[PDB]
Design a binder for this molecule. Structure first.
Ligand SMILES: N[C@@H](CO)[C@@H](O)[C@H](O)[C@H](O)COP(=O)(O)O
Ligand SMILES: N[C@@H](CO)[C@@H](O)[C@H](O)[C@H](O)COP(=O)(O)O
Ligand SMILES: N[C@@H](CCC(=O)O)C(=O)O
Lengths: 657, 663
């Protein structure tokens, strides 16, 4: 889900400039949820903008943001020419995991048929059912089935029973969050408090951007406890200021790089155009707009696949020295010694991040000599897996906010384990709450299906492995072999990408099929699992990864001349076994596409369709063997008329149940 | 693939009776699959059996054993009424590997046109190329494309180049196997050693049954290294009469006798003058042991298939797995196979479960309760991947090897891997005498009876119960877990009846089979205790029905796989009354929200989901760590019924190995 609001204080914006800013803000957040969208602004058509803050307009529609962008326009009642010197507008895109994605369930929610309070919510209220029964007895009627409505009907209940005629908007919000259980990130707007916004969070991201040609009064807003000129963030001499409430930084970087990341239970409030926190640090974002632009590519996913030569380099930058063959991960310098005195490695993650652990488990066992266990976070929690004080627990999360991975982290901390975060998001929950960690530095990933995040996690775990064995004489040559492979890896990725057209041709032979089996073993078990997940996610074909050594134990019965099959046969120590699996598939009349090495002349002669990738070190080959399956999934989706950036039935980053 | 030889020594039998015994032996071996079979026996129609011992007749044929039986009785020049006081007949079912199926490539393979030596073989001789060249240079002409023929030609080469006129049959075979490379189980017969048999193995099972109305000299045959006298071999004491049964599978012996000797690698067993001795290149020996197997356990009975039988008899097989091991009278568990090792096991620091296929799913199905009751780390490994990674293993690891057959290559090699590293090894098997039961430090026989069906049904649930019982032993000294143990054991007490209740819903499962009759895919979703149920159900439907069924961990839906859900994709969800109930409901709402209309396997009394879901399979409630047994049976039946509807033979393997090398 996504939150975005635009508060222009004494910065004249017409009603069109504001709506185009709310839509443009949701477009930056659409990848977090694109089942429905909505906006909330001030209505009325009075030239004097002051006589219009008493009328709230809600435009909510089902579909992506482009369905709302057109619903907002071509309306017969809203005059898009009213100049507003002061105005507040809130927007939201929703990931409808439950129920229908109807406009009544989309945000902003309302508290009554006159819109006295409207709120946009990211998260879940674990006791909204109790709140719903309490509010219905006092005289409040509910319309939607969402848990967000109990937040709107309640902020109005605290307003209908206040003690003084002018209780601050903060006091009303403070009484609400005290009755809310679970996680949430809220942004309120009310007719009674014109132009005033309130932003509180608890277990969900919520920052506040600021732009102004004037100087700011401070760069460290002091948190308060239940507000003068030496307490609020505001322009000194004049009033020109623009705020940008948002649950992510991509929606704000386009307008300014000065945000204030709030914290749990911090109740920010903009009053008279002054930002004050109740119960901070105005900082510069380290992100360029180009990082969240498609560039010359037709889709984010295509960009992020073809940029893997660069993102791999950025992952190793300032960490790998090829002249002296040294590896240093600054994020682990103060813990690497204690990590080596531990007795077991546990990798915990979901989805593609889990596959990155599968892809590096073998080399981690080799170079650390420690037991390495790889766990799906959801199952890890269901079983109450035993964890001990001398366990090192890794948490792989591109977003750093995945619910199951994050709860596994707090589970392992409670048991005294040493926790390490492998993240792609600075300041994320998982990067903060782990004892140490590594930022893979692959750049923002906008496509729902992770591509560069996987290969960057892969490389990051390999670098950790190289550190763990940098004091073993017997492993020096093995380290050199691996590091030379890493030096040559960016160019070999480029070689794989040059086969883009050859992959597209094979896709034309498969897009009509209902199923495909992807078979691999050893280092390429993860490859066939990740490839199967990608084809599932964006093409909707029934693709499944099958461990090659397991074919003879049942799954081989599903192979015939009609069943599409992709096999991975690389020149490592399992080559002979992979050839036996291939012979078994052929005996069953299978006609598989084989991903193999360029020099594998035997395989290339005896197989019609082969994807010939260049050879790398065995423990790095998984990076090269997965890219063709990334490309294949992309082309299959295009052939089937689907969107590769917005696959049906989900969005990016699972931050709730 | 199947070996059977019958040696009657001073037990008069007619040629008819001998041939009927050989055929009946192969009938017990057909379930393993084969493309041809043959028999070898003494020819000639001289009324005195002693003169016919120099004429070996062969009857081999491509096809089913029934056709072979017709060919036997269809011999105008063969008199079936000659009585043999002493005779050795051998029989074999072949699964072609080298040389296409044909009469010439069938067993027994002969050493020359006069059949001086014949041999039946299970396995593959790797260096059969080199051996063939050598024997051709010495003047031996080959007539078949089988690797086996090199064995028959080589034993005649040793005979033709023997130093003394009275070199033993054993010595010849010893010299043969010392030149062979690979895996083999062999039985030899020769006109130069009438009435004698020699059996040997390396990497393939071979056993010997024995029957005599007279007392036997011993129940422990001592090994002889390179004097064969009355104190060193097996034989009837006061009289000569005795019968021997060589076989690669006890199923071909059990109807005649339950006293068997399991040979080990490089053993050379020989019957000379009706006396069985075991040669080899305190005092080691081979035990004559009693099998508790019965012929009825390998017969369909009133069922139309072995798959149907082994599914529907699971109330009985679960009871057999628990017999003598669970005392509901005082809530105690005793696995006799672990008595001398339970103490060490409790001092170890990690459990590793290693297996392939459905046996691996048995580990996944019990991982959680093992973690709970042992409080140790529990790692579940697919044997093939375990080997590829050179997984770290330590002296204080307890490694379990789950295998119905006890012979699966990758599982067995994982066992030997762990032994080299000093780990305590434990075998969970269903085949007495198998490699994994022998080479583990200790083990548990799950005692589900032989599994004749192609797919693992009762073996899975019996493994499930066996691992739960082990878990109950590991926590029997913990006060805080007494209640939890009682709850689980009362569940085991009620489990056989709860299985019958599930089996009584067979009609409801058929209705579901007709709904999926035309479908090409089905997603089976679950989590926690029922993750294994999804994986095992998906494997069954793949293996038996040949449709693309896949098990999906419910917690992973929102991470990608949920994109497959729409109004067309068939889905089966498992929602039971355990601690993951709310999370499973969430997954159900996620599926429905995307136009999915799934079939739900749920508890009988889950009124909410039964009303909000059209088709529900309503199983009875049990302990959470036992529900997996009840929720998997409907998927076993589903796979069975779908295959029947689509005209498939559920007792037909299909899953064949690599093609036949024609050379
Ligand atoms: N990338 C998606 C699959 O293409 C999804 O599986 C993703 O990996 C999963 O949601 C985990 O997200 P995270 O890396 O941010 O924790
Ligand atoms: N029987 C099959 C399951 O349907 C197969 O997966 C089997 O479980 C696997 O081959 C392992 O065999 P094992 O139990 O004899 O070791
Ligand atoms: N390799 C031998 C025996 C195979 C077997 O039946 O096990 C053959 O193909 O004839």
């Amino acid at each position: 889900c996504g939150i975005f609001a635009y508060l222009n204080y004494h910065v004249p914006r017409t009603r069109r400039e504001i709506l185009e800013t709310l839509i443009k803000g949701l477009q930056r957040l659409e990848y977090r949820g694109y089942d429905s969208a909505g906006v909330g602004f001030d209505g009325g058509n009075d030239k004097d903008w002051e006589a219009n803050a008493c009328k709230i307009q809600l435009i909510k529609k089902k579909g992506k943001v482009k369905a709302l962008d057109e619903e907002v326009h071509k309306q017969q009642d809203m005059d898009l020419d009213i100049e507003f010197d002061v105005h507040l507008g809130i927007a939201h895109t929703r990931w409808a995991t439950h129920g229908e994605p109807s406009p009544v369930n989309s945000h902003p929610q309302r508290s009554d048929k006159n819109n006295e309070f409207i709120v946009i919510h990211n998260g879940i209220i674990t006791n909204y059912k109790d709140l719903k029964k309490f509010l219905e007895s006092k005289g409040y009627d509910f319309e939607s089935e969402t848990d967000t409505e109990t937040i709107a009907k309640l902020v109005k209940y605290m307003y209908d029973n206040r003690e003084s005629q002018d209780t601050s908007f903060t006091t009303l919000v403070e009484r609400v969050i005290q009755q809310l259980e679970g996680a949430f990130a809220l942004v309120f707007k009310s007719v009674h408090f014109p132009g005033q916004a309130v932003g509180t969070r608890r277990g969900s991201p919520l920052l506040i951007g600021v732009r102004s040609e004037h100087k700011l009064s401070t760069d460290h807003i002091p948190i308060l406890y239940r507000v003068d000129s030496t307490t609020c963030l505001f322009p000194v001499e004049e009033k020109a200021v623009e705020y940008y409430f948002a649950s992510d930084a991509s929606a704000v970087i386009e307008h300014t790089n000065r945000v204030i990341f709030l914290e749990d239970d911090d109740v920010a409030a903009v009053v008279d155009g002054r930002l004050s926190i109740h119960r901070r640090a105005v900082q510069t974002l380290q992100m360029e707009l180009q990082q969240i632009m498609k560039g010359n590519f037709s889709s984010f996913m295509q960009k992020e696949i073809f940029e893997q030569p660069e993102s791999v380099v950025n992952t190793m930058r300032g960490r790998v020295n090829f002249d002296d063959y040294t590896v240093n991960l600054g994020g682990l310098k103060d813990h690497i010694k204690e990590i080596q005195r531990c007795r077991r490695l546990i990798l915990i993650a979901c989805g593609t991040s889990y596959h990155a652990g599968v892809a590096t488990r073998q080399v981690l066992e080799e170079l650390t000599e420690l037991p390495v266990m790889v766990e799906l976070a959801s199952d890890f929690l269901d079983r109450n897996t035993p964890v001990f004080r001398d366990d090192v627990c890794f948490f792989l999360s591109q977003s750093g906010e995945t619910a199951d991975t994050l709860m596994g982290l707090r589970y392992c901390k409670e048991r005294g384990a040493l926790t390490v975060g492998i993240t792609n998001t600075v300041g994320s929950s998982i990067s903060r709450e782990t004892d140490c960690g590594v930022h893979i530095n692959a750049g923002p990933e906008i496509g729902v299906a992770s591509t560069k995040a996987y290969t960057s996690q892969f490389v990051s775990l390999v670098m950790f492995a190289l550190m763990m064995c940098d004091d073993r004489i017997s492993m020096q040559e093995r380290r050199k072999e691996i590091m030379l492979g890493l030096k040559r890896l960016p160019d070999l990725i480029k070689e794989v990408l040059s086969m883009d057209d050859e992959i597209q041709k094979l896709a034309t032979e498969l897009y009509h099929q209902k199923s495909v089996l992807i078979m691999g073993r050893g280092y390429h078990y993860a490859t066939c699992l990740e490839g199967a997940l990608k084809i599932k996610e964006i093409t909707y074909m029934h693709s499944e990864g099958i461990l090659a050594g397991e074919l003879k134990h049942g799954p081989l019965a599903l192979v015939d001349k009609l069943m599409p099959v992709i096999m991975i046969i690389m020149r490592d120590h399992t080559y002979a076994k992979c050839q036996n699996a291939l012979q078994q598939v052929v005996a069953r009349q299978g006609r598989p596409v084989v991903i193999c090495d360029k020099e594998d002349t035997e395989t290339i002669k005896n197989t019609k369709r082969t994807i010939k990738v260049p050879h790398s070190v065995d423990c790095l080959q998984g990076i090269l063997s997965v890219i063709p399956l990334q490309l294949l999934a992309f082309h299959l989706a295009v052939l089937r008329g689907y969107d590769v950036d917005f696959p049906r039935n989900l969005a990016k980053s699972v931050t709730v149940e």
